[PDB]
Each structure stands twice: as C-alpha cells, then as structure tokens.
Amino acid sequence: TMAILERISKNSQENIDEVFTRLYRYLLRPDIYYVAYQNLYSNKGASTKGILDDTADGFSEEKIKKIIQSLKDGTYYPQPVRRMYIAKKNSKKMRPLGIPTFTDKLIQEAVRIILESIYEPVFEDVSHGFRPQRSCHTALKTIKREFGGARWFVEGDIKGCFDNIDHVTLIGLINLKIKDMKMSQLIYKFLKAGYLENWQYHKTYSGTPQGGILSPLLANIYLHELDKFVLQLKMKFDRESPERITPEKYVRYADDFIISVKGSKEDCQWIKEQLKLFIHNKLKMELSEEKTLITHSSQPARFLGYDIRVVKKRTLNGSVELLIPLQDKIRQFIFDKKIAIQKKDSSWFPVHRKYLIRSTDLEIITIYNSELRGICNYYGLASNFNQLNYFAYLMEYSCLKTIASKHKGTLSKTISMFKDGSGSWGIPYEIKQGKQRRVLYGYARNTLENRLKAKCCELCGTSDENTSYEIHHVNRKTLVVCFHCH
RNA sequence: GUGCGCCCAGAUAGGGUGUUAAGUCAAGUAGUUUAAGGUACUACUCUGUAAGAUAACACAGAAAACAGCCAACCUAACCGAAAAGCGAAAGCUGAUACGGGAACAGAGCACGGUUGGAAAGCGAUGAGUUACCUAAAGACAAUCGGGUACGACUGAGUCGCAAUGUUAAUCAGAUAUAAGGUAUAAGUUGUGUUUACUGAACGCAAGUUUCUAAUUUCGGUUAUGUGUCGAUAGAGGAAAGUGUCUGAAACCUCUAGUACAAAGAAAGGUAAGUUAUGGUUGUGGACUUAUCUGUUAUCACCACAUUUGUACAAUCUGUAGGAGAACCUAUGGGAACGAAACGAAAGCGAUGCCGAGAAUCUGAAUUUACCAAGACUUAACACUAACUGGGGAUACCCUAAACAAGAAUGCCUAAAGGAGGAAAAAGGCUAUAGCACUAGAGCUUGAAAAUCUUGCAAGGGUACGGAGUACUCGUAGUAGUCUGAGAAGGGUAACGCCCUUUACAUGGCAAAGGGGUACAGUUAUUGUGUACUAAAAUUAAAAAUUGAUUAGGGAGGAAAACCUCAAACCAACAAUGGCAAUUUUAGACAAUAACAGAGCCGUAUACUCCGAGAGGGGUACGUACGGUUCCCGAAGAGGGUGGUGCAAACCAGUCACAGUAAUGUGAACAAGGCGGUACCUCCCUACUUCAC
RNA sequence: CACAUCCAUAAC
C-alpha cells in the first residue's frame, strides 16, 4: 500500500515545526490524517479511480505492483514525455493530460496527501481562483464585483509556469515543507522520471504522459507558494491609493494576473520593477512588452473573456464594477468551424454549417446541444444582456438548416412546433428550411432557454424534432419522447 | 445504381430547332393611299389620366392566333394484388375488374381532348378555445367602462398582388476597340493576405470590398418592437371620463417625438439598378432615383416623416497622446489613424469578343410619306437527341430430362426347394402430431414419380455512372477519302484545334458493358530492412568512473513540542564512452485484398431559364474524344459456404429384452444421421435505400 | 434599464 508517505508528512522532524505554516495550524492538523486512512488509502479497489467515468476495473491489487510496493518498483520507471496540449472551447486555459497507463493512475492516490496538506488552510480554491470554495466558476463572478474604486486593470502576456520552467525550483519548493531535514530520501526520486524527448536537454515538464492529472495539481502549488513572499509589498501598497479618490486586491489565475486598486500612474512604476525582480530571480524568465503595457484605460482588448469595464457591445458604467463580454472571443471559434459569415453584405447570418448531409438526425442536434450548454458555466452572468440575444439568432437557424439540407427538397414535409415559445403548437407546412418564425448569478441562464428548451419532452434541457423520436417506454403510461443520452 | 440513359446509321411510328417558296385568321367601328396590306394619318365611340375626389380637352391605348400557369373531370401508359399461359416455376408479359390518376423528374419523347377563369406562397384576417396595463398612488367591484390588430392559438372565410411572354419599321451615315460590363478557370497546402506549387497557361502587383456615418431628447438603448428613468413643457393631479374606499404636495400617462428658413413635402401603380446574398441561376416581397401631361373654377387647411445649408453646447464620442469617476492637447464628429472576414482574390493594364434607348449631329422624308414571318397548317432543304429501330460476350440463381458418377435386396424350411408360397424394411401416394431430421400406418411394393453434389442442352433477371496505361472474348460485315487522321507532317495551342497534300481497299473509329494476366497510387490486416558512408543533435540518459563538497533509513501503528514494537544503504545538480532508432547535412522496403466521382477550361454537337448583346449558373464531370490535379464511400437485409454453444423432439438391435423378420418398448444431450435458435464473419451479387 | 424577436417559394 501507500504507508510510506504516511510516516513522512506526519512526523516531518518537527522540533522546530516545519511544514507550512507553523503558527495557525495545530488543532486542524491531525484532521487530514483521519481522512487519509479510510478515504484515499483507499479500500483498496477495484472500485477506486479510473479514466472511464470514475470506477476502475478489477485487478489483483494492483495487479502485482502493489504487492511489492515498499521495495521501490520500478527503478527508475522511464516512460517518455511527448508534446501534448488540449485546447478548450472557452477560457484559454491549457489543461493537458497524457498517455493512458495503469501505472499513472497509481500515483494519483499519493499526490492527494500533498494537496490536502496545503489546501487547509494555506491553498485556496483548487484550479485557479482566489477565495476557497467547492467549484471553479464561483470565484470568477463574485470577487470581481467587490472592490475597484480606482478603476484600471492589468492584463497578461506570457504564461510563466508551463513554458519556461526552472526545474530545480519546481522541486526545490515542495520539499521545504514535506521533506524532512534528517532521514528523508524517498520523495523526489520519482518526480524526475518524466524526461521529455524533443532533441533537447531538459527534464520536467512538457506533456505530461508521466502524470496526466498530476500536472494541474502541482502547477497551482508552485505558483501560489511563490506569491506568499510577495504579500509583504502588495499589502503595504494599498495605503493612500484607495483613499485618494474616495470619498467622492490581487486575484490570481492560471496564466494571467490582475491588479486592483491602483492610481495613479506614478505609483504603477513599482509594478514593473518589484514584480520583475521576483520573476527574473525565481522563475528566471524575461517579461514580454514590460508586462503588460497599461493602456489606460477602457479599450476593447482581448483578455480571457471577462472585460472589466473601467453594437453588439454596450458601454455600461457607473459606481460599482460589472462585467461586459468582449467581441474578441466570438470572432475566432465561429470562423474556425464556419458557423456564421460576416461580410459579404448585410450583417450576421448562419448557414449551413458544414456539412450538408452527414450523420443521421439525432447526432446532428446533439452537437449543438453540447456546445451551447457549456456557455452557461462561463457566460452565466453579464451586464450586456442585449448581446446574448443577438447571438441566439445565429444558432436557432444553423441547427435547423443542417437538418433540412439532408432531405433537400425532393421528399415530403417536416413536423415541428414553436420553440420561442410554450408551446408546443403550430404545425408549419414547408419543404426546405423556414416557413414563418421557427444580475446575481444569474438571469443570463434564461437566454439558453429561449433557444431550444423542450419540444416537447422536458427532461433535462435538450430537444429534437417530432420526426426523429424513437418509440419506447419510460421503464400517463407512455409518451413519444426522445432517446439518446438517457 | 437518380425511370429511361452505351456505340454506330436516319428524319413525323412518335417530335423539335434554324433557313425559304406560300396559304389561312385577326386590327373597336368608317373613309383616303392601298390591300385578304396595316397601330402612320383624318372623323367618331369606349377605357386609363387619384404624379392631391370630379368636369371641359391633348397623349399613350381598343382584337385575334400561339407559347405558358391552374382548378374540377373520361380513359390508354406505369404498379402492391387479378385473370389467362409457359421446363408447373427461378421469373417475364397487362384487350379487362378493384385502386394514387397533368405519374413523384419534363430539362432531349409529347398522354390527349372539353368545361371553368382559378390554386400552393407572400401581405390584409372572418369564426372558436383564450392572455395584460387602464389616462389619476394602488387594490377591488368578470359593473361591454373601452374594448378585442401589438394578439397567443385551433383552423381558414373574404379582398389586392403571381391573372398575360410575344404582339415587327417614316431613311442612311459619323463621334464606333466612346464613356465599362461578361471572359482568361477548379482543386491541394504555407498563413502576419508572403506571392506557394504539379503536367499553374496567363502577368505586373500591393493591403481591397465593406461598416461605427445625420446630435440643443434615434439622451442612457440592436436589423424589429414594447415598456419606463433623468434634464424641461406641467395642463390633470384622494369624493376617478362606469362604482367605492384609503396615503405623500410628490410621480405616471400625454405634451415643444430640431431653434428655423427654402424647393418635393399623403394613399397606389408602371418602367430600370440594389435588396432575397453563405456554393449559384431564377420565379416573389420591402427601400432610394426617375416616371405616372397643359390650363380654368367651389377645391390647399394641417400638427409630421426627410435632404441641403447655418449656429452652438451637452449627452463624457473616435485615433495618437495625456490625465484626480466629476478631466487634459492636436485633429473635427474615421479627415487611412484601428479591427474582422478575405488565402493568383479585389484594382489596373495588354490581347480578344460584343453593339441598347439607333447618348449627341449632318442630309430628313413626301400621291399623309412605307413595312413581307407574331401564330397555325402544308411543301422542300441542312443538321441533332438518354426517343425509335439493329446488336447479347463476362459472373450467379433455379428447373426439366427413369441422361450419369458417388450406394442396389430385407427371410423361412434346412448349396437346394422357396418370400412367383404369408407378411413387414426400402421407395412411393394423402391427411397430420412436430422447428427440422425420422414418418405412425392402410395400400402399392421386395429397384419405381423429382432425396443431394455436378456436367451437357436450354432459358430468365442484372453488371448499358468518366478513375493513370498496355489487352484477351462478341469484331475490322450493319453506315468503311470520317466528326478521335490515316504516311510524312507547316506553324500555333498543355493535349485538342486549323490548313494543305493524299493510298480506291482486311489503311482508319479496328461499335459500347463487364473480367483476367503485369505494373505508377491509396486504405486496412499481417510481415519485414533494423549503419550502404562521414558528421551534428543525441532517444535508452537506468550502470562503473568522472567529488577529498551539503542533508539522507527500511517493515508498521499513534496528539504539536513525540511516544512504543520487530530488527552501512541510496539519490540529484552533470560529463565521457562504445552499442540499437530517427531527423538534418552529404555521396524505409514486400505479399495479399478492394477501387470511387464531386468538378472546371475548350472544340464539335442537343434542351431549359435570365439578359438588348459577350456569357454564367443546371440538365449522370449534360451525352463522346483529349488533357488534368484533387480524391481511395457507407448502412441494412436475403440466397450459399465455413467455424463454434445451449435447449427440446423423433426414428432402426445406435444399447438392452420378448420376437422369424420388420416392429413394440422403460431408456438418446452414455446423441448415428439432421435441423431450428443464438451467432462473430469469409466470399459473391444493383436484393432493397442513402452519398450525386 | 429592462423584456420579447421577422424574411418565403423554386432549382442541384
């Protein structure tokens, strides 16, 4: 099993208490050891962790490596590292994985002790964010609507954790709170096994086939720990700056950073000097365009997707700070898949998209319901409500045009209703496509309901056509409903 | 596998286009010239003149024959099923009855013939089931108070617009390579639109098209619409403009929806460009310009919707730059300062092609000036088609014929007489238990009527959609001095293409589909070279050595500062070194199996639509020929064959008993034959759809 | 500042 790590972080040769911290962690310290015995030990399965859903398959424990685990094995486990990066549809945050390997999943149970030992009470919010919660999007809508009296903002340029890696600092920082000063040598012997293969002398990391889920877990600890020594200058900087204008905050992410409470430009000279010496000494990487060239102030630039306001667009400002969606994130992902075409002439129009005749009938609508449902997790709160209504005009006609193009105009008619709507009535008689008219968290979720909500099953949020349902049963005995996901 | 769809001949079986000799009908009604001609002229009737109701009077216009859109209706063509025939069935063929009936594509084979004057759509909505404010601060009283075009919805009534295309002429010439719009392409991949390419045939070549565009209330606000906040214009402003009650001198509706001046400044319709645009043509509906005659008199009064010009400031309006949200320079509301989409695309230019009101003018013209195909019929000539008429190879399925190969007979008395004396297996003729195999059994019978595999003879259906070459069968006869050129070739063009010369006969297209034998080129399975040479980066980078350098243990359990038990090893920051791989610099390789079609340019030759023309977009890349990159298709369901389980049933001594034999029989998933089901697939084939 | 959304028929 994994009983070797349990006898390392508990003792730690505290005398002289090591770990982090050592002034406000005494009663809440043994609470982690109680969980690391019946939960992440684990059973051990069989039923533990796996790539398929969550529950793994059956093994001989597990199957033979866990039998002889205290005697290293393997030594030193090569496993090459190849270039791999997964791009998401929203929020430019590279979350790569790795080559699926049964040995890779055995390390996930060992790194959880490191994460739980820092998450309380030091590390806050797993995967970016600032305030500690239980999700990922709960710290991107409430924190931005708090402070912000001196307006302005700071964007980002390069990354600073994935590209230029100091290698030694990445390992030389975690051992300061886990590795013991005396009798400690079975920790960092398996972290240097991920030697990258790209005709260059480097090691860790650029993949990572050695650890798919292990990469996002260690990337947040290396970036948050280095900011602890920086707090001595940011807390002493917001003295006369917030009280200069009134009367009439440093949120971190994955690759970019923002700086709130500024003013004036004479005080911003220390931003490109105090923060530059910390990166050149620790991270050892030259900054790009001085980082990040203050535009001062309001300008439709590109930054993640939440343009902090300090047609289409709509300039809305006042006393508090809100969020306005910019137009740079909607002019890239659309043209790469040929969803809408600008000019041409007129303005915005769908068609078709590609291809004309493909798949069947249920597989076409599922693609549109899989790309529009995830927008609520990101663009679920925005002051520019009129912009979300214009974007729905390019999706209500694009999903239906692909269906009518499969049957062309040499067959019969189609059966549909009104999805505006409620509904569901109105049976139009058409052959081709078209006939007539086919704050807090918050209210932006209703925008997705006006598109395709239920026609007319009402079960989860998707809807198809009356000429594509499969006759089946539930197990008001039966009802002609859809059957694809459940 | 989009009905037919290939190649080579022709000219009403059934039909179309173009060029002529001719005939017939029509011009609202007369006259003149004149003619079975014709919108010119004169008189007259009627209609349009609402570019703002109507009258008087000048211009544009009056029919008919066709093409073509549609509704209601006979039957032949096509089909799931008739009937009647055929090796009695693998399948084909409709003089009929019952059924969609311009057949679902008419755009290259017409369906035809009457009546009727109208249908789908796009704007206006008649009837029903039914949703929200109320001019006043709110609620209630369904008090038709006020309704019910902001309608949702069931389902369609009644009016405009698809409901006319064509309907030709008083002459000629000049500004005529005029003012500027179709050609001169597809497709693949480099990507900051950089000039990237093969067997590009076209270049030069940089930033183009286009929108945020009008400010003393399109102020804070979309391509549309509704509602309410602030600056001001405050008449109403708790006994409500139906009925009643209860709180603030402050918030709702409405109103100065530009300070103003000058010329159009209202409902429709017609004739040309943009709008409907995603990859294109085109039939419909909304906005600009222009048009929808002169003149007299009751008829023009009016708050608006816009353009141009002028003045000023705010709503914190753009770029560079600057700056305490309540600001600060230049510029003046994109003054090329940003951004997105565009990947030899926009502009420009050479060459080539085309000629509309005959822009603008010179001679006009003259018995009121002089024009010969709009439509139908008939005759003749040139030319063409997926139509008609000839022609039937390579692979499968099924059946007939006591043709044949792979097998001929069961007992008793005891080799012979005898089952020619008695009867039962085996075969065959019915019903039927049963999934099949096997029949129980009367009779026939003790070699007979199709048990199977397969050959010969013969027949039906289908492969009658282009992939790079070289060919074997049906073949140089049915179109043979051709439309792919015969021999040599002149020039140009990528191959085609054009011109000239020319053998009177197996010179040439040697008429298509579909296979096989070798080989570029791709997908998939398996297999294979794994220093043929030097060098660079090195993947394995784990090991020994390169260090006299910092901190290091190897089973488990338990609070923080630790407490109990059993009892030297090793790592990193890195270097060198041969060994096996790849890339760069330099002198991956086989076998086997299958092969598909979205286009584009141009010659020759057939239809439809748009435009006055160059042409483009479709019709199987339109059907051939030639060139040519891009690009290696799928699902479902039968007829065969092969591999591999479970369950159930029957029949012979397959096992046992009685018995002359056949049979009976507890007992066959201790299975001999055989089949259903489950069932991953191989192979073959338009079996039926989809990708065009 | 807030809520609801408008373009068909036909030919591959």
Curated annotation (Swiss-Prot):
InterPro entries: AI2M-like_HNH, DNA/RNA_pol_sf, Domain_X, GrpII_Intron_Splice-Mob/Def, RT_dom. One of its GO terms (biological process) is mRNA processing. It holds the Pfam family RVT_1. Its EC number is 2.7.7.49, 3.1.-.-. Mobile group II introns can be retargeted and used for highly specific chromosomal gene disruption in bacteria. Could be useful for genetic engineering and functional genomics in a wide variety of bacteria. GO terms for molecular function: endonuclease activity; RNA-directed DNA polymerase activity. It catalyses: DNA(n) + a 2'-deoxyribonucleoside 5'-triphosphate = DNA(n+1) + diphosphate. In the N-terminal section; belongs to the bacterial reverse transcriptase family. This is Group II intron-encoded protein LtrA. Keywords: Endonuclease, Hydrolase, Intron homing, Magnesium, Multifunctional enzyme, Nuclease, Nucleotidyltransferase, Plasmid, RNA-directed DNA polymerase, Transferase. Multifunctional protein that promotes group II intron splicing and mobility by acting both on RNA and DNA. It has three activities: reverse transcriptase (RT) for intron duplication, maturase to promote splicing, and DNA endonuclease for site-specific cleavage of recipient alleles. The intron-encoded protein promotes splicing by facilitating the formation of the catalytically active structure of the intron RNA. After splicing, the protein remains bound to the excised intron lariat RNA, forming ribonucleoprotein particles, and cleaving the antisense strand of the recipient DNA in the 3' exon. The correct folding of LtrA seems to be facilitated by binding to the unspliced precursor or intron RNA. RNA would serve in part as a chaperone that promotes folding of the protein into an active conformation. Purified protein lacks endonuclease activity unless complexed with intron lariat RNA. It may preferentially function in cis by binding to the intron RNA from which it was translated. Residues 317-463 are annotated as: Intron maturase type-2. Residues 67-308 form the Reverse transcriptase domain. The gene is ltrA. PANTHER family: NUCLEAR INTRON MATURASE 1, MITOCHONDRIAL-RELATED, PROTEIN YKFC. The keyword Acetylation does not apply. Its cofactor is Mg(2+). Homodimer.
